[PDB]
From a paper:
The presence of the Histone regulator A (HIRA) with the histone variant H3.3 in a soluble complex has implicated this histone chaperone in the specific deposition of this variant. HIRA is in a complex that contains at least two other subunits, Calcineurin-binding protein 1 (CABIN1) and Ubinuclein 1 (UBN1). Furthermore, HIRA serves as a scaffold protein to bring together the other subunits as well as ASF1a. It binds UBN1/2, CABIN1, and ASF1a through its N-terminal WD40 repeat, C-terminal C, and central B domains, respectively.
To determine the molecular basis for HIRA homooligomerization, we determined the crystal structure of the C-terminal half of HIRA (aa 644–1017) at 2.4 Å resolution. The asymmetric unit of the crystal contained a homotrimer of HIRA(644–1017). The observed average value for inter-subunit buried surface area of the homotrimer is ∼1440 Å2,consistent with its high stability. N-terminal residues 644–674 were not visible in the crystal structure, suggesting that this region of HIRA(644–1017) is highly flexible. The trimer is arranged in a ring of two layers, composed of β-strands and α-helices, respectively. The β-strand domain is composed of two β-sandwich motifs, β1 (residues 682–774) and β2 (residues 775–860) motifs. While Asp800 does not interact with an adjacent subunit, Trp799 is located at the interface of the two subunits and forms a hydrophobic patch with Ile771 and Val806. This hydrophobic patch interacts with Leu851 and Thr853 of an adjacent subunit.
Numbering used by the authors:
A (entry chain A): 682 to 696, 700 to 871, 882 to 965, 974 to 1017
B (entry chain B): 675 to 871, 883 to 894, 900 to 964, 973 to 1016
C (entry chain C): 682 to 817, 821 to 871, 884 to 891, 899 to 964, 974 to 1011
Write the structure that this text describes.
């Protein structure tokens, strides 16, 4: 189970200062007991009434949402207009979280839902967290909801899983006890930085291992860098994806891994969806080409892309 | 550890024959005769369909338990948890669909087929587009705490299921949000105290056939009126009922203007005059905003906002 | 329920079949930092790539497009044909049992007999965690995986069910014991899954006509369910010729209306190129001259 917020006479909750006040069953109208939802944001205050008691609340710069007694979920605009019909959840609410126009409800049954209330679509449809934690005695130490409506569970053992909605999977994006980052020898703001944590302030070049042949450290470094690219992808973190894609590409250039390099260049050139995490794949290519060019070994690859880019410019 | 007892939806009994009036406007009768012959060891059941004196028929390889039909489709549910869907003139449209549990009831509206199973799951398919609309949603959430019944069941012309419960509550399933949504509630209705100036929502509510409050200050009646009208607008959107959405949005905007709800009507106008869909519920939003600006202009406090909206709108000569 | 592969020190598996594509796994070979590494190696034609993983590989699978591995702690990783990790490791809800890959389609069947299919090229799920308790009381047999990512399960009772991703359903596309094929009288993956009729002495001709109708309509719908495009063309036009020859006018007109115009394509073919191909079979019957005429609508 999960702790269910107990009924109260009234309460206040904070969240860019803005807060929520709730007063339950303050008045009666046509036989219907009313509960009040007040939102104090900057200078302006809005309010509204609901026909059942408010158990918990959450809000963002765009959205206020409220979990009420009869397993009901209501969502209101930045200025207090009801956005959606009340949502019946299959289990009593445990916690609510909002990020932008994304609303996340975690129920007492340990299931997790995420809606995009601006677009009026589900993002994460009732994902059990048993399916993650399994027979292991772990604990979801934290839970974050990104600006894309992507949930991330930081577990007690150092592993972080985030749900990919298009793949409909939980995906490992950090494992502090099996990280390859200290081994990784190659030439902060976003989500991936925050989840992994060692992104506090540590961009130090790593040392060559005295313990293993060079090829082992090369493969550890490859694997680490491809993990970072992949992870920024599943997290849909556009800026982090660009950063790691460029670092990885530089490493491929400097170590001479031609097949992986040509492969990503082909994928970024197309002949296919022209975008990844909302970036133009060919603009990403065009950003990599100078790095490719600084190594004479790839002069033809650099040239091929460049020429195939110019032909693309001439519609 | 299983419950000693768990209610289920009932499964139609095997019958040798039955007929069923499945059509109204184009009146349509369906006849079923089960296990009437054998070919190659395979026992066959017959399905017959009568529409306006024209008659088609076909055979199935298992007993037909129940059936439904519209102007567009006829579908049958059979033992071994199979569902088959046939065109208006009798052609099988899709492979037999394996249901997760035995059928209980079938409904059709246009090309939408809805199956409610013994396990109390609900499915809706658009057989014209051949896409699932509602994927095996448990009815447990809606039924827990009820009196074990559902008074009425609608499948709207956009394939949305609506459950009207005896306690006055109606829940519809929204396919995009993927939620059960409360779109009506006669007991907790704010409608009787709301003071302001054929569709699905109209049917679900008892409303197709207000006083000043003495006990509370005027602001409370305004807030109940606002909550009610927002509920109506949201309910119409959830039902994807376009005429009713436009109607309630227009009443709601008139109210916001009358009582001077500045920030709410600002928000609504910004949304209607725009990552932005030009459409809601199959309507051109800017057209609706144009249908507002009369009402908004009718008030002095919103002169600036009417001017700005007719401005950026008239900038559509470009 | 289903069996889990047991840990090994090393193993090899031929995966693809276009060239000899071999895969070699060496579990926990070296330690970088405190991290034990397992090696993944892939040989295809003359080319060898490799990479490391941080947990032990339990089984592998692959195709001309991808190699994927299932590891301990219920993890699933996917790599390009150059050894590049394509996706973050995927947490399976239950330990793996088997893996299949067809092109860029990856299918996991876990020990809890739940089945999943991902399109790793487009990065979308095809089949999201489908239990086989429902589709299975008989036991299972061969599991196929088509080139559009459709799962197909042949069961021990002769029935095959394939999972349509759009309808999100299990659909019956073959049933040997109840097959209407032996008695039907008319003159890709569906062939593979399924495997002149005498006239019947024991039933009236109308029963064999309806059985033949239902069989052909089943074949059309099964090809359309399997997304097998050439089999759909074939069976549509065999069925259409049965309709023409036997005089079933309303089914025929209906097919023409649909193919005329509304979605403009079917199973990746132009719905009007099909009307073009079956206008002449309509034309060889005098009774349907008007229909062959009424379809002369061009533009």
């Amino acid at each position: 189970k999960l702790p269910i917020p107990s009924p109260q006479r009234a309460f206040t909750l904070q969240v860019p200062s803005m807060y929520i006040e709730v007063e339950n069953e303050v008045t009666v109208v046509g036989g219907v007991k009313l509960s009040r939802l007040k939102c104090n944001r900057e200078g302006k205050e809005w309010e509204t009434v609901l026909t059942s008691r408010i158990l918990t609340a959450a809000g963002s710069c765009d959205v206020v949402c409220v979990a009420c007694e009869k397993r009901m979920l209501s969502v209101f605009s930045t200025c207090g207009r009801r956005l959606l019909s009340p949502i019946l959840l299959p289990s009593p609410i445990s916690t609510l979280h909002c990020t932008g126009s994304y609303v996340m409800a975690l129920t007492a049954a340990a299931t997790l839902s995420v809606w995009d209330v601006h677009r009026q679509v589900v993002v994460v449809k009732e994902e059990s967290l048993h399916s993650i934690l399994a027979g292991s005695d772990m604990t979801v130490s934290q839970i974050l909801l990104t600006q894309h409506g992507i949930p991330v569970m930081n577990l007690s053992d150092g592993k972080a899983y985030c749900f990919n909605p298009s793949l409909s999977t939980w995906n490992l994006v950090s494992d502090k006890q099996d990280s390859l980052a200290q081994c990784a020898d190659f030439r902060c703001s976003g989500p991936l930085a925050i989840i992994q944590g060692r992104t506090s302030n540590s961009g130090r070049q790593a040392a060559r291992l005295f313990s293993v042949p060079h090829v082992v450290q090369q493969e550890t470094t490859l694997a680490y860098l491809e993990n970072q690219v992949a992870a920024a992808l599943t997290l849909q973190s556009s800026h982090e994806y660009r950063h790691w894609l460029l670092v990885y590409a530089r490493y491929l250039v400097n170590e001479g891994f031609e097949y992986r390099l040509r492969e990503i260049c082909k994928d970024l050139l197309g002949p296919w969806e022209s975008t990844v995490v909302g970036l133009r794949k060919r603009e990403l290519l065009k950003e990599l080409l100078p790095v490719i060019g600084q190594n004479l070994r790839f002069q033809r690859l650099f040239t091929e892309c460049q020429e195939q880019l110019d032909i693309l410019r001439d519609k």
